[PDB]
Design a protein around this ligand. Structure first.
Ligand code: BCL
Ligand code: BCL
Ligand code: BCL
Ligand code: BCL
Ligand SMILES: CC[C@H]1c2cc3[nH]c4c(c3C)C(=O)[C@H](C(=O)OC)c4c3nc(cc4[nH]c(cc(n2)[C@@H]1C)c(C(C)=O)c4C)[C@@H](C)[C@@H]3CCC(=O)OC/C=C(\C)CCC[C@H](C)CCC[C@H](C)CCCC(C)C
Ligand SMILES: CC(C)=CCC/C(C)=C/CC/C(C)=C/CC/C(C)=C/CC/C(C)=C/CC/C(C)=C/CC/C(C)=C/CC/C(C)=C/CC1=C(C)C(=O)c2ccccc2C1=O
Ligand SMILES: COC(C)(C)C/C=C/C(C)=C/C=C/C(C)=C/C=C/C(C)=C/C=C\C=C(C)\C=C\C=C(C)\C=C\C=C(C)\C=C\CC(C)(C)OC
Ligand code: HEM
Ligand code: HEM
Ligand code: HEM
Ligand code: HEM
Ligand SMILES: [Ca+2]
Ligand SMILES: [Ca+2]
Ligand SMILES: [Fe+3]
Lengths: 317, 319, 40, 280, 60, 258, 60, 60
């Protein structure tokens, strides 16, 4: 249609990913990166606690996870949570006026899981989250319902039978491309083989479909815009599948592709039973998690913001 | 109107030329010629008449079915909401039949309309090829155009006839979509290890490039010599003239050698017609003969070697 | 144009009877389907 | 050695710089000022390109250093130096060699200039050739400059400069969605569609059926008027072509330029402006 | 019959070659654009309801 | 393309299949590239190429046969053409060196002004009338509705001084367009034809600017035999005269700029 | 056609043929355009409620 | 062929050869089309159901 002439100006950012002149380069907008950081800032960690006194399970009667911690630490981990999840509706969000131990309001129930959820991440999935970790903020960023949560997208409108063609619509999911645009469910939620790049010189070995690769391209797109980078970041395009060449990040993300599965298959999906309507998608599936959920357009959530470190209750006990 | 033989400064008009007499059996031309001052300021102003016989009518009607089918489904997905139609036009497109049908005739829903609108577009071209063949011999003309158009058609069918069918799945076929078809060529490459290393694909580029190159030379040269009547190639091919008489010397002195006013047009032909020739092939080989053109290259010591400043592990072998 | 009043009125007449030829053949068409498969 | 009709054209004069001095013909070529110039760049670079094949990525004794025309490669220096000269070994060659490219391309045009100046022909060819050179001045100067690193250029490796085209391409995801890029592509295709059409017609009118005379412009017009209705015109095509050709390159130049300096996000996304329009 | 009174004068400015030809086209495409879109619609007749699936019966 | 092969496969069994066809087609072409010009004339600089050879890589092709239309002769390609004439002397006894035009280079008929002896006949249309003729004969041709009329404009010159005024323009029956301008020189009061290629317009001052030759040069312009039709012979010798101006109309032009 | 009386003048500058034909087209497209647009979101008698049963009931 | 009487007059204004080719072609597509649009839906007679599966008694 029309030709672009400059919606962004020079000189853009630069990051040499590969050997001199390999094409592998990262180009980022200066200002945007600024605003992103600025508006994408964490919340100062709370003051250290006495870490002494009695234990959680000692006094508090209905505690199933934060027992290891003491009182001050636990009271602390209760504060943090409220500022990170529902700093808007106060403690009454996951509790009952007076019943500091009741489990009537679903917000609590999940909170329990969500707790184990986080911990796990920082404790067992360190190849991905590294020595940094994630907190309720990383996803909730101060909102009862994480803004960047997903669900099985229904797709385009119903032509009364021939509607299955779910690849003709620019969904923000895939960086405004025209791919299936719903790779999150089949992949991030399921476990469909992402690999299609034949490993043999001649044909007759790989039965992969052309559509299949389009699907992978889908997911990749989405992932690419989730962390907010360019494939160069993870790979050298001439070797989409040669790892011996592709980039350390490539692997790091690998694990996440499953760390996400884990988060949906063993935590987010089970809670649906208690989650209300406004939290359930059209297909009845609950709002799950995606690379976009945490990362939210930044290779390293909150630009390497190390929050979990200052919170011992946010680690497997 | 800057005159570097760019825009016809002053135009003139004569009675609508109803084409030259055709042979017996060829229907008389139709359409009252039109005149456009602007258009004519680029080249010719008169318009039509146009020929339309059996093959022609049978074609204009045929392919016009495919287009409808396509544009139809497109406006169908948008739930017949033109608003969102003219919005997602680029994205909208008629997707091919799912792999769960191979080559069998799918229902209008799951890939049917595509196939139908496909055959109607396949023959529409094959038929149109004959339409051109009938316009050549009817004027005692040769079939250089058909030969070329054929070549193009070759690569056209490679995207559905010879390759997909040779693969046993209508899935390996380009879809009816402005954007989605860009993804097709985008995916195809990814699926087959990067077409940059595919031999034929390179050879074909040499043409997409060469082509552009030559015309940039020719189209230009003819103009630069348009002074000495260098545009009238015909009478130049018959009896060489001063235009073509310096027109070559230039190239000769510049690059050493050269060709004749006629000759060149022959190069151009083979530099353009050979484009798709190396097209249908490079794709006819992909999927069937080869599956990963990258390893294929290095297999023959083609792929270049680069130092290792960056490398990633492999959780598969590890775990 | 390209004609006078005479040839003009003659065309219009026959041209009409041919149009009602359609409406009738099509309305009767609709109706036959209307009975079979009711739309709306 | 001259053509049957060459002698009567080899006139003296029409030189831009120091013509009379180098004003002469060496075989079927012409020298003049710019004539010698380009050469002084040719061997000074062509050989350096060979010196690269000789030396190699790390060293001449390395296992990387190869002579396979396919694997041969001359990549530019890191993006660290930016606009600084890197060691001849670590990017220096490319840098210098490239400076020889401009000296060859540009001079080659300038040389064509006065060459036409002698034949009293039009300066179309050179002006046209300019674009090609211009496009180059973008993939090595313009772009890199607004990117702050001569390392943004493309490697000089028969197959090596393809990867640089794959990465930088995917650097913006699906590089197929670039506006200028698309547009340009269309042109390249139209152009080829033009050649396959022009060249064909000529040969189809000057070499008709057996026992047939050489057709005239009277036919050409009708021919394309009977298949699709209108006929652009004789020189018209020679115009149209020249247009497409140049346009193809121009829009392309823009295509890569906008990629990076004027846009860092993913091209596929750029099209969003059309989506976020208050109309749908 | 009412309007048919002075509507004859129409052909005096609008050539019959025009109407006749365009009319055919419109009514042709237009028509096909109905069984078509409507077909794709619920009241499909080819493979919607009846004939009740015999394919299933006869096939196997 | 490697000297030694250790790998075999279908993909490569078809690639070479191309190069052979290519190496062949490039020759097919070359052959054709010699249907006008060769053989060469001298030896100033011994034919350069990876492999010298007598007359190029490919032996000259067989003479093609061109049947012109009705009322026409016949052309052969290639053809043995008789040696031409050079109205210039060698700027130096050293081969390659240029040839200086004798007398007034503006009409020495050399280089820029030099033109081959095209057929002393005239090009025609499909039926048989002279293709290019003056509007004084083209009873049908008229100026495009809107576009300004040339007939009546004063033809200026290089130096700027007026050289004459247009009395008519020559249109083309075959290809609707304006190819020449029946200019009426003031000096010689003769009638010379002016080619579009050199004809520039300034609709503002009703002129037909010309940077080719000076206004004075318009005087001795190759006259035409029949004012009712332009002969191919002269036609090519016409606009060629103007070319000279492109390199002779001023000593400064041929002279270096730096 | 009350005040339309004076409007008689329009014909000399608004060419008859053109005005009629052209206008006749504008509606052709619009007519479909609209039907298409309304048929899109508002209500789709073709695939919304009854008397359609054969479609859904007849299918399964 | 009753109405044929008045319908004869059409030949005087439109070139007979046109309506013939336009139709001989128009039916060409329609036919190739129907078997297609139908064979792709209502009953894919060729290899969807009856007769004796070329797959069952075939493949085995
Ligand atoms: C345009 C975008 C990219 C690019 C993208 C691509 C892609 C994509 C492809 C090529 C391909 C080619 N490119 Mg590249 N290429 C670029 C810039 C260049 C430049 C340059 C001076 O800037 C050069 C010289 C080349 C040269 C070449 C050729 C080796 C090869 C044939 C193309 C062709 O047929 O054109 C038409 C013209 C001709 C046939 C005539 C002249 C070209 C000759 C044959 C090439 C000689 C180059 C030579 C090896 C350089 C050293 C010369 C020394 C004196 C020995 N590229 C830019 C950076 N290029 C194709 C290929 O196969 O690469 C392996 C291919 O598919
Ligand atoms: C993942 C990869 C991306 C991609 C990434 C890129 C990138 C990255 C770039 C392009 C560029 C281009 N791409 Mg892309 N491109 C993709 C897919 C495509 C497809 C496709 C069908 O899929 C097509 C048709 C194209 C088409 C194009 C061209 C429009 C454009 C090259 C323009 C040009 O004319 O340079 C014209 C030529 C030149 C610059 C070279 C100058 C020539 C010199 C002066 C002469 C050399 C003479 C030599 C020394 C002598 C040889 C003779 C020997 C002595 C014998 N791309 C995919 C999606 N593309 C490039 C571009 O936009 O350039 C503007 C670019 O940078
Ligand atoms: C929708 C649900 C129903 C159904 C309901 C309807 C309805 C309702 C209608 C049709 C109509 C038609 N249906 Mg049905 N139809 C169904 C299933 C089908 C199937 C199928 C395979 O399942 C098929 C093949 C058809 C086929 C057809 C066509 C015969 C017909 C379209 C006529 C037309 O538009 O002419 C296009 C028009 C023209 C070319 C020009 C106008 C005609 C004039 C009067 C004659 C030309 C005069 C000329 C100047 C003189 C020269 C003569 C020659 C041209 C030389 N139907 C299902 C079961 N069908 C339409 C019909 O037949 O109306 C009568 C109609 O109204
Ligand atoms: C959405 C809810 C309703 C519905 C509500 C409406 C409404 C509301 C309207 C229609 C109208 C129409 N509907 Mg409905 N419609 C429905 C379902 C359908 C279905 C279906 C398959 O389900 C179909 C096929 C139709 C079909 C139609 C068209 C017959 C008609 C549009 C006429 C037109 O565009 O003139 C375009 C115009 C012209 C070509 C020219 C202008 C007319 C002039 C006055 C006459 C020509 C003069 C000329 C110069 C003289 C020479 C004569 C010849 C041209 C040679 N409807 C559903 C059930 N429908 C419109 C209508 O009926 O108008 C009467 C309308 O207003
Ligand atoms: C819009 C402009 C179009 C165009 C036009 C065009 N090209 C032209 C011309 C014109 C009008 C000429 O007049 C000129 C020509 O052929 O003159 C006889 C030419 C030409 N177009 C050429 C090539 C070319 N054009 C291309 C494109 C185009 N040319 C566009 C379509 C392309 C591509 C990439 O598609 C190529 C490859 C040349 C054949 C020729 C110009 C030759 C010339 O001037 O060479 C000068 C220099 C040397 C011979 C020596 C170079 C050695 C240096 C010291 C080193 C430089 C290193 C180099 C950068 C590395 C390249 C490595 C790659 C293999 C990776
Ligand atoms: C590994 C191994 C064993 C190696 C061996 C190596 C050996 C033996 C080496 C020794 C051999 C050597 C050194 C050879 C060197 C040869 C060299 C350097 C040649 C330099 C010349 C050069 C760079 C030429 C470029 C030519 C190119 C690429 C042109 C591209 C366009 C193209 C297809 C041109 C061909 C057709 C032509 C000539 C078109 C030009 C042309 C055009 C465009 C018109 O419009 C026109 C109009 C009217 C009349 C004529 C013409 C006309 O001629
Ligand atoms: C509603 O629409 C209206 C009426 C308004 C008209 C508007 C229409 C519009 C706007 C249409 C727009 C169409 C567009 C934008 C189309 C775009 C198409 C694109 C981009 C296509 C790109 C590539 C297409 C390819 C490569 C197609 C290849 C097709 C092939 C190879 C088909 C092969 C078919 C075969 C071999 C059939 C064989 C017959 C059988 C199947 C029987 O053999 C067993
Ligand atoms: C500052 C306000 C808050 C206070 C004072 C507070 C206090 C407490 C206390 C005292 C307990 C343990 C008591 C018991 O069970 O016996 C507790 C448990 C719990 N609170 Fe809070 N809380 C606050 C906000 C929140 C919020 C906003 C959430 C929700 C995200 C939340 C979720 C929970 C959960 C899930 C448990 C049980 C933990 C377990 O299973 O180990 N609380 N809270
Ligand atoms: C340990 C800290 C966390 C706490 C206390 C917490 C708490 C909660 C609560 C109370 C809800 C229910 C909200 C409602 O709808 O009323 C919820 C939902 C959810 N949480 Fe968390 N969460 C934590 C961490 C996370 C993290 C790290 C992620 C990111 C992957 C996440 C993702 C989600 C999602 C996807 C939902 C469903 C959306 C919704 O309920 O509206 N949560 N969380
Ligand atoms: C938009 C540009 C990108 C494209 C076109 C792309 C394409 C691909 C393809 C085709 C594969 C499958 C390879 C095979 O057959 O084994 C793949 C896998 C993969 N990509 Fe990307 N990718 C892109 C960006 C990224 C980015 C930015 C990351 C990093 C965060 C990434 C991480 C991965 C991982 C981890 C896998 C392996 C998945 C598995 O376990 O199957 N990719 N990519
Ligand atoms: C499947 C989608 C995901 C992908 C592909 C992915 C990928 C990556 C990659 C490649 C990094 C390393 C970045 C660097 O080196 O600078 C990273 C870091 C990180 N990711 Fe993810 N991630 C995904 C989902 C998530 C989710 C859902 C969370 C949220 C709980 C998360 C939390 C983190 C954290 C906290 C880091 C920082 C660790 C460090 O500093 O090294 N990621 N991720
Ligand atoms: Ca697709
Ligand atoms: Ca209904
Ligand atoms: Fe030409």
């Amino acid at each position: 249609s029309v030709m672009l002439l400059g919606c962004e100006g020079p000189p853009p950012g630069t990051e040499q990913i590969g050997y001199r002149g390999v094409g592998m380069e990262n180009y980022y907008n200066k200002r945007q990166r600024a605003l992103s950081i600025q508006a994408n800032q964490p919340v100062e960690s709370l003051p250290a606690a006495d870490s002494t006194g009695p234990k959680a399970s000692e006094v508090y009667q209905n505690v199933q996870v934060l027992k290891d911690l003491s009182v001050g630490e636990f009271t602390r981990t209760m504060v943090a949570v409220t500022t990170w999840v529902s700093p808007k509706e106060g403690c009454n969000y996951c509790h009952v006026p007076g019943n500091w131990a009741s489990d009537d309001i679903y917000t609590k129930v999940v909170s329990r899981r969500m707790f184990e959820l986080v911990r796990a991440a920082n404790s067992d999935w360190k190849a991905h989250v590294a020595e940094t970790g994630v907190t309720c903020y990383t996803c909730h960023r101060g909102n009862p319902v994480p803004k960047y949560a997903w669900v099985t997208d229904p797709g385009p409108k119903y032509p009364s039978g021939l509607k299955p063609t779910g690849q003709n619509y620019g969904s923000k999911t895939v960086a405004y491309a025209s791919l299936p645009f719903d790779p999150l469910t089949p992949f991030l939620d399921q476990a469909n083989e992402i690999r299609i790049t034949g490993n043999a010189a001649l044909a007759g070995s790989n039965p992969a479909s052309l559509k299949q690769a389009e699907w992978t391209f889908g997911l990749m797109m989405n992932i690419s815009d989730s962390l907010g980078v360019g494939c160069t970041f993870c790979h050298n395009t001439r070797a989409f599948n040669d790892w011996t060449q592709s980039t350390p990040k490539r692997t790091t993300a690998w694990y996440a592709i499953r760390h996400v599965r884990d988060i949906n298959q063993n935590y987010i999906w089970p809670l649906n039973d208690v989650l209300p309507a406004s939290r359930k998608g059209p297909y009845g599936d609950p709002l799950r998690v995606s690379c976009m959920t945490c990362h939210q357009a930044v290779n390293k959530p909150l630009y390497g913001a190390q929050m979990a470190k200052d919170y011992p209750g946010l680690y497997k006990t | 109107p800057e005159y570097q033989n760019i825009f016809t400064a002053v135009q003139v008009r004569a009675p609508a030329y109803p084409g030259v007499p055709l042979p017996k059996g060829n229907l008389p031309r139709i359409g009252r010629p039109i005149f456009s001052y602007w258009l004519g300021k680029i080249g010719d102003a008169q318009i039509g008449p146009i020929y339309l016989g059996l093959t022609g009518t049978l074609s204009i009607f045929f392919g016009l079915v495919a287009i409808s089918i396509i544009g139809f489904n497109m406006l169908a997905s948008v739930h017949w909401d033109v608003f969102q139609f003219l919005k997602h036009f680029f994205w909208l497109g008629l997707e091919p039949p799912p792999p769960q049908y191979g080559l069998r005739i799918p229902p209008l829903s799951e890939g049917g309309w595509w196939l139908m609108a496909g055959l109607f577009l396949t023959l529409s071209i094959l038929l149109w090829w004959v339409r051109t063949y009938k316009r050549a011999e009817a004027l005692g003309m040769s079939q250089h155009l058909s030969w070329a158009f054929a070549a193009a058609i070759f690569f056209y069918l490679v995207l559905g006839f010879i390759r997909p069918v040779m693969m046993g799945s209508w899935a390996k076929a380009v879809p009816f979509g402005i954007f989605p078809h860009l993804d097709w060529t985008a995916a195809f490459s990814i699926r087959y290890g990067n077409l940059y290393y595919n031999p034929f694909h390179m050879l074909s580029i040499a043409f997409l490039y060469g082509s552009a190159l030559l015309f940039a030379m020719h189209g230009a040269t003819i103009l630069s010599v348009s002074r000495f009547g260098g545009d009238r190639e015909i009478d130049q091919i018959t009896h060489r003239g001063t235009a073509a008489e310096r027109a070559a010397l230039f190239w000769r002195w510049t690059m050493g050698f050269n060709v004749t006013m006629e000759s060149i047009h022959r190069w151009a032909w083979w530099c353009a017609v050979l484009t798709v020739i190396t097209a249908g092939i490079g794709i006819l080989l992909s999927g069937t003969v080869v599956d990963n053109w990258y390893l294929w290259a290095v297999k023959h010591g083609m792929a270049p070697a680069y130092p290792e400043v960056v490398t990633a592990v492999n959780p598969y072998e590890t775990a | 144009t390209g004609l006078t009043d005479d040839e003009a009125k003659e065309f219009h007449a026959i041209f009409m009877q041919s149009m009602y030829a359609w409406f009738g053949l099509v309305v009767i068409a609709h109706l036959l389907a209307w009975l079979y498969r009711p739309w709306l | 050695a001259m053509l049957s009709f060459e002698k009567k054209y080899r006139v003296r004069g029409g030189t831009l710089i120091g013509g009379d001095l180098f004003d002469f013909w060496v075989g079927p070529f012409y020298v003049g000022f710019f004539g010698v110039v380009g050469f002084c760049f040719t061997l000074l670079g062509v050989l350096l390109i060979v010196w690269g094949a000789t030396i190699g990525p790390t060293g001449p004794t390395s296992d990387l250093q190869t002579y396979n025309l396919w694997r041969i490669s001359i990549a530019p220096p890191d993006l660290s130096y930016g606009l600084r000269m890197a060691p001849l070994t670590e990017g220096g060659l490319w840098q210098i060699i490239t400076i020889c490219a401009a000296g060859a391309f540009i001079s080659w045009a300038l040389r064509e200039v006065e060459i036409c100046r002698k034949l009293g022909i039009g300066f179309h060819v050179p002006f046209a050739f300019s674009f090609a050179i211009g496009a180059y001045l973008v993939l090595v100067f313009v772009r890199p400059l607004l990117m702050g690193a001569w390392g943004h250029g493309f490697p000089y490796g028969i197959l090596s400069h393809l990867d640089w085209v794959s990465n930088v391409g995917y650097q913006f995801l699906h590089f197929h969605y670039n506006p200028a890029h698309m547009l340009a592509i269309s042109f390249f295709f139209t152009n080829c569609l033009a050649l396959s059409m022009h060249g064909s017609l000529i040969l189809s009118v000057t070499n008709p059926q057996k026992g047939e005379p050489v057709k005239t412009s009277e036919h050409e017009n009708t021919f394309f008027r009977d298949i699709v209705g209108y006929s652009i015109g004789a020189l018209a095509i020679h115009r149209l072509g020249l247009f497409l050709a140049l346009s193809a390159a121009f829009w392309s130049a823009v295509c890569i330029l906008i990629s990076g300096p004027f846009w860092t996000r993913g091209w596929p996304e750029w099209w969003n402006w059309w989506l976020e329009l208050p109309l749908w | 019959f009412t309007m048919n009174a002075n509507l004859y004068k129409i052909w005096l400015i609008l050539d019959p070659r025009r109407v006749l030809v365009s009319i055919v086209a419109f009514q042709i495409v237009l028509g096909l654009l109905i069984h078509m879109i409507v077909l794709s619609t619920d009241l499909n007749w080819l493979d919607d309801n009846i004939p009740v699936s015999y394919q299933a019966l006869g096939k196997k | 393309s490697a000297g030694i092969t250790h790998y075999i496969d279908a993909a490569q069994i078809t690639i070479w299949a191309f190069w052979l066809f290519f190496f062949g087609l490039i020759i097919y072409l070359r052959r054709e590239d010699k249907r006008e010009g060769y053989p060469l004339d001298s030896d100033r600089t011994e034919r350069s190429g990876g492999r010298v050879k007598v007359v190029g890589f490919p032996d000259l092709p067989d003479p093609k046969t061109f049947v012109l239309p009705h009322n026409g002769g016949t052309v052969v390609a290639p053809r043995v053409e008789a040696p031409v004439a050079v109205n210039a002397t060698p700027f130096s006894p050293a081969p390659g060196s240029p040839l200086v035009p004798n007398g007034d280079p503006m009409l020495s008929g050399f280089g820029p002004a030099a033109s081959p002896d095209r057929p002393k006949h005239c090009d025609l249309t499909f039926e048989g009338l002279p293709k290019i003729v003056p509007m004084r004969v083209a009873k049908e041709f008229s100026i495009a509705e809107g576009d300004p009329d040339p007939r009546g404009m004063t033809v200026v010159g290089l130096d700027g001084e007026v050289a004459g005024t247009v009395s008519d323009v020559w249109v083309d029956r075959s290809e609707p367009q304006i190819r020449y301008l029946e200019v009426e020189v003031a000096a010689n009061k003769k009638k010379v034809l002016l080619p579009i290629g050199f004809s520039r317009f300034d609709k503002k001052a009703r002129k037909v600017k010309v940077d080719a030759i000076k206004a004075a040069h318009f005087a001795n312009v190759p006259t035409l035999s029949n004012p009712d039709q332009v002969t191919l012979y002269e036609e090519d010798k016409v606009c060629a005269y103007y070319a000279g101006g492109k390199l002779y109309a001023t000593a400064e032009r041929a002279g270096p700029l730096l």
